Amino acid sequence: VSPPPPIADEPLTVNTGIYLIECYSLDDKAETFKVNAFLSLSWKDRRLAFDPVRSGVRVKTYEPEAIWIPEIRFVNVENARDADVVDISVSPDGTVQYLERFSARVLSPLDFRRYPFDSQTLHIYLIVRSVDTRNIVLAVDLEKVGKNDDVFLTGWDIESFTAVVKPANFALEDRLESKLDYQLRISRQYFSYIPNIILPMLFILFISWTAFWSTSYEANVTLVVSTLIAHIAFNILVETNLPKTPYMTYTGAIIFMIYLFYFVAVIEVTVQHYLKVESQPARAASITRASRIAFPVVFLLANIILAFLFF
Amino acid sequence: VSPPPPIADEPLTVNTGIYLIECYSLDDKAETFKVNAFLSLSWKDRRLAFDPVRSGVRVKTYEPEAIWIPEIRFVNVENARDADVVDISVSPDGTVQYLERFSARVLSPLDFRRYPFDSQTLHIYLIVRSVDTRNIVLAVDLEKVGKNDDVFLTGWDIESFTAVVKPANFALEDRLESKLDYQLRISRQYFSYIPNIILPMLFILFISWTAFWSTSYEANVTLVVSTLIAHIAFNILVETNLPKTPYMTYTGAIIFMIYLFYFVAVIEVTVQHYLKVESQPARAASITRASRIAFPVVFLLANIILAFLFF
Amino acid sequence: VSPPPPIADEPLTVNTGIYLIECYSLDDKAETFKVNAFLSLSWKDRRLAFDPVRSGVRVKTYEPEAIWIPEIRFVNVENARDADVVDISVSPDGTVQYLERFSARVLSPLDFRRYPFDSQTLHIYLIVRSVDTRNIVLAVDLEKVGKNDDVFLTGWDIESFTAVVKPANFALEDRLESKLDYQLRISRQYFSYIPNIILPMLFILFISWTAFWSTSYEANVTLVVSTLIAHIAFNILVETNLPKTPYMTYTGAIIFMIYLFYFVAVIEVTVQHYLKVESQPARAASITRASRIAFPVVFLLANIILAFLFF
Amino acid sequence: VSPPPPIADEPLTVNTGIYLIECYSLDDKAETFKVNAFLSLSWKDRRLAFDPVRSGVRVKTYEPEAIWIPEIRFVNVENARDADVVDISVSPDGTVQYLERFSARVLSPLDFRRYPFDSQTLHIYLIVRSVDTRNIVLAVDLEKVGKNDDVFLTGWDIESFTAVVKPANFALEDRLESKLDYQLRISRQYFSYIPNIILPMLFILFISWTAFWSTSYEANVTLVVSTLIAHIAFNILVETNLPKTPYMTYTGAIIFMIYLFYFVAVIEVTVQHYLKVESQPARAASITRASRIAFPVVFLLANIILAFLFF
Amino acid sequence: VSPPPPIADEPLTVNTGIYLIECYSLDDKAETFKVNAFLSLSWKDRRLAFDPVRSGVRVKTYEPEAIWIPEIRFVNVENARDADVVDISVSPDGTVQYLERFSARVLSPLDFRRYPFDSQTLHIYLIVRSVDTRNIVLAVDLEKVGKNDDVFLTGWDIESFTAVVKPANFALEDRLESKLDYQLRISRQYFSYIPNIILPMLFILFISWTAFWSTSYEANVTLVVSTLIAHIAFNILVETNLPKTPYMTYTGAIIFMIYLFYFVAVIEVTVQHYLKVESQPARAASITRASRIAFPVVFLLANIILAFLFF
């Protein structure tokens, strides 16, 4: 078949909607998420008009091969969607109602700056390319945009699923292209990061600071070096959950900063021992007593500064 | 073809059944399981009625393209099911008997609160969408619901496979949708968690408590810090088997609590050494002797409280 | 087409065979294995009989769509097999000879009780469902059962590939079902477990026992705790190669038992130090000297008991 | 169909273009990247020429099976591309305009010599094989070569996407083959390697050098051995992100060199202790004081030499 | 269609060739490699002979469904190859020239005895099964066997790609089967194993031997136990890259042997301490001084013996 012809010189308007049935597998490293959803399409084809009184039916059903259907695609998908047509309904004035159920793997960039206390705006870009015979333009039918109440994205809270109603119409390779932006707003469930990463990392750091109440060099070296190794393990664990970024993340900044605290603690432990061996313990004692206050204080202030810069 | 027309104005009833052939790959992190099963369908199509005496046959066989078949889907699947039609049988009054064998990857949420002593209710949601010409509604044929005796789900015990007989009828995108809930009740085989995670974690903790029978600071620091690192390793091992949850799991709560015991043990070991160096060993000895009882007692009471809150 | 009609009221016999071309990817955790094989089928269809003298040919060739073929399936496969038809030959009396080459992923439970010195019986279950017009029953053509000499399953020795010649005929959803059991007997190549897991695990344990020839508490704590951590690493390594079982495996039992030896060694090291500090070294020396014999002796006896219970 | 015949002796020119829609999953170990793109093709088929006045349309649309289409393939892809035809447009003189959207996994070798400060030239090779009746040759339509502004390759900066306009025409198996080279120039975002690998590795190394301000052998052995183990962990982490190369990478060279510094530091710590026990501390003190300067100086010079040899 | 009939009792010869376009993903653990290649086939079908003068064409082109094509398969593939037909050419005497491009995952056993200084012979087995009407036999057209100059197999050097010209003809299920052996000779790039595994493993071993220049038991235990743990880490790293073998590999033998050196070093360190505590240091000093020479000497001799047995 070929596209419906214009009454005059108007573009063909294709009304769209996406209804989310499942959202799963938000992969942070790949910056992808999987979706299973209804895609609804609506347009006018006057060649399909009929008389209700005469035909004795308010609606006709067609198979996809029998009529013209716009080639709708997703911009930001790995591979073309897996689609199954559910229904095609034609009303007497030639208004087509198309419904498919599809699944796809979507590429959408994530901003990790405030990880694990981050929020994201996932995008699903709908697109249509114009044909020689006619310009095709997309619109949003808001009554056919939504999500099922049970849609859960493990490790995330789903805030809203809306569409930017005005398309981005632009030229690509001498044809018009009409693009819509469907936006899925989500926020990370930071809860588990507290007992599993943040608090264990703070406990080992505070354990290293017990060295400031000890004159045993051998024990101090064991305290600071062992805890540092445990800190390295947490640093490695965290970076396996995340892609490499051309910026610092909030957690990355704290993790990095804690290395400086371990480094300065080793210097203090070394300086303390060196003075004692040199028969200057009163001086070592001044440095050690100051360290007992300076370490937790500088750690608290540095964290207030970091929280301020990031939030 | 198109749907069978009503004798009057009754909905079309599609009777369903699921017979489980295989259940495998319950993935805790993804909250998925794979299934291989029979789907049986039954409905009345009077246009297919025939005379047995005349035709000389009690049953007719058809191919799926020759007749009308309801578009049955699963709600909570990653991709549409892989289905192969096994048989279509039509009796003289036009009763169709449909049988397919399918495989699918099912999304079903898991409650990890009592992990690894948890039970789950897996769901398989069957669905059909109504057409303009007719409301289509699902029912359960209980004689065609079951599972093969050999179905094993590795790491789990299978309790029951039943269906909620009344469908959930509701409107979605201006059509009626009829949804059935097939429920697979399972309970986790907690056995291996005992020798592999729980007991080793208790042994290292009890080893750290030997420090309460030692005056050697250097040895004490080695005992408590080394065992803490081993505890971190078990914490990391456990969290790799589990998704991130917006709540505490029973194992997660014990693991987290044990960190506090390691932390207080380091404080005690530090306080003991500090007093001895200050020439107050009699006092250090009072704190150490009290710790020998306080640590195991507070550990037992805290575990009784946790078990009570979770079970 | 439809099934060949009975001369009287006999079931249709479908003769089967499986010839293994490749066996690969025995996955212990998933309890699966991949197979690539010939499936041979044979049955009588009298409607296809012809005269050899008249037709001037001993055999006719058909394409699968031209004739009736039984719907043969595998019970214990993840997804339906990937099949390609190789040949269909019809002899003058209407005997059909069918040959396909297929690949499949097979689910088959493994018994890990004697791991890594275990043997297994893998199963491939062939099945056919009877039709309304005729009962279909399976049989084994032993001349068409075997395996190629080069079939290798990495990490395993292949003993035999046989079929249980009598089918399991039973009712499932009001039709007869005919099931055959093809059995692939294999035994694990335990060799590499010796230099890679078993001996290293014994070496570190024996290294911990050097503490029974040392009065240095600090050194003893370092010896027993460090080796225990290495033992934890081997425990974790082993459990990553295995699924979770509702029973103890032989290796699992030894690994678990070794923890008790580490635990008692820490107690001995603690008791030794405590007595020396209390000015009772003669007594500490009695416990230490007894431990030098008791530890290796109790370890040898406990291993004889375990080997007896498992083998 | 078969290829359009020559007016007189000339090869058939197929004009090509690639417009990149998505670039993702640059896998360093596999030396692959995934691409989603438009492929545009243009050629003259005079057998498809038509009269606009007669046919009643100015352009004709066809399906791929209705006309002759050149067999265009990619050289360096794992499997044949997943392609969906978007449009086939024929103008009155028989000029065909072909447009498909495809996705593919591309093999392209990477040079890791300057990792993680490396740049790469990824290739997509387009190819066509000549037929008996006609030589087919490829060209670039520069107006149809480009990339969307949002194309992001996580962990990389995209510099340019251009084509080498002259094809490589050559004989393979007695036929002409026409090959085009599309080049995607990228540079690695080295940023995250600094806080995550490089600085932590320098901190632990500098911590080992505190041993040059200590006379405690026991503490020195703990300092140098513990930090060496942490260095091994970083070496292992880095090599998991990279393939095995028959040459040294810049990071690999620094990592390897640091082992020599740990080795010499152990020798120094051993020599120091040996002299002190032999009652030669004045001499040990000379070696230790020299080491305080020699270690950081030789480390700085060796790094200047390495940076010079690699950049 | 059906096979070309014999002039007189001679088998049909199918000439073959394989031209390698890409070799990738040699997976050591799975013993697989991926290939992308041309498969060329040639045979005589006299029923397709034509007169060039009469027909006015020197060559005819066909589609695969229009003529008889031999069912060529690969023996040692996971799944059937992904093939696309490029060209079918028929010359006037009825000589068919067939060309396809395919991709496949190939199973080929690897000999790890001399890992990582090993060479391998990968096999691609081509096969054809005879039909009732005709015996079919394979041959090699050497002019159509080759590889593109750019074919690279990451981590390997490609030496040669040749075919064993004489087929292996044998009976399987009462038909003749004709099998060709295409051989891809490769040698491992051992380079990176030196700086990444071999040298680090030697450095830690030599570090443990510093204990022979120390009288400090506590420091000695730290030196030998810490390095042993690092050795365990390298053993685990190496075994993750390799399948389990029923024989010792060269690297495996060195790794295993090094454990014995660590074990004897612990005995020496224990014996040294025991004698010193017993007031027999002169004797301890004799054992320690002998160990300084014995350890490196026995290590050198044992490595010469191992290299001799393996190479």
Ligand SMILES: CCCCCCCCCCCC(=O)OC[C@H](COP(=O)(O)OCC[N+](C)(C)C)OC(=O)CCCCCCCCCCC
């Ligand atoms: C990149 C960061 C560099 C870190 C440098 C930190 C030095 C701080 C000086 C402390 C002042 C003090 O109080 O002690 C300084 C003492 C010297 O003491 P003295 O002069 O002999 O005693 C006083 C005698 N009267 C009576 C004459 C006054 O030296 C030390 O303790 C040595 C320990 C520092 C070693 C850290 C090494 C890290 C290696 C990294 C190389 C890249």
Ligand SMILES: CCCCCCCCCCCC(=O)OC[C@H](COP(=O)(O)OCC[N+](C)(C)C)OC(=O)CCCCCCCCCCC
């Ligand atoms: C986050 C939780 C913080 C933990 C604090 C624990 C308090 C324990 C008080 C001990 C009571 C006691 O028995 O002794 C108090 C002693 C001081 O002894 P004295 O009073 O000087 O002697 C009396 C002399 N006459 C009788 C002759 C006059 O202090 C200590 O041993 C210091 C060791 C504890 C340090 C723990 C460091 C933790 C770092 C983490 C920072 C975020």
Ligand SMILES: CCCCCCCCCCCC(=O)OC[C@H](COP(=O)(O)OCC[N+](C)(C)C)OC(=O)CCCCCCCCCCC
């Ligand atoms: C879950 C299992 C727990 C295992 C307990 C092992 C008991 C061994 C007793 C040895 C008998 C002996 O000979 O010495 C017992 C000695 C006391 O010696 P005394 O009696 O004071 O001296 C005699 C003086 N006269 C003769 C002059 C009168 O105390 C110890 O050495 C204590 C060290 C062991 C502590 C282990 C703590 C583990 C914490 C884990 C908590 C769950």
Ligand SMILES: CCCCCCCCCCCC(=O)OC[C@H](COP(=O)(O)OCC[N+](C)(C)C)OC(=O)CCCCCCCCCCC
């Ligand atoms: C593969 C690299 C091997 C490295 C060899 C390093 C040589 C050290 C020379 C320093 C100069 C010095 O001053 O000390 C050298 C001293 C001997 O001194 P002395 O003769 O007793 O002193 C003078 C006394 N008079 C004046 C009375 C005569 O021995 C040591 O400290 C021993 C420690 C080094 C052991 C390292 C073991 C490495 C094992 C690895 C096996 C492959």
Ligand SMILES: CCCCCCCCCCCC(=O)OC[C@H](COP(=O)(O)OCC[N+](C)(C)C)OC(=O)CCCCCCCCCCC
């Ligand atoms: C699996 C392999 C087992 C390894 C055993 C090797 C023993 C070497 C003997 C050295 C000869 C020597 O010179 O010293 C022998 C000394 C005893 O000396 P003495 O007679 O009391 O002294 C002389 C006194 N006069 C002169 C006054 C008479 O014993 C030791 O130091 C003991 C330390 C070795 C313990 C190793 C434990 C490993 C546990 C594994 C158990 C399965």
Ligand SMILES: [Cl-]
């Ligand atoms: Cl799409």
Ligand SMILES: [Cl-]
């Ligand atoms: Cl479905």
Ligand SMILES: [Cl-]
């Ligand atoms: Cl099947």
Ligand SMILES: [Cl-]
């Ligand atoms: Cl392609």
Ligand SMILES: [Cl-]
């Ligand atoms: Cl194949």
Ligand SMILES: [Cl-]
């Ligand atoms: Cl034979």
Ligand SMILES: [Cl-]
């Ligand atoms: Cl034959």
Ligand code: NA
């Ligand atoms: Na259409």
Ligand code: NA
């Ligand atoms: Na220590």
Ligand code: NA
């Ligand atoms: Na139908």
Ligand code: NA
């Ligand atoms: Na058929």
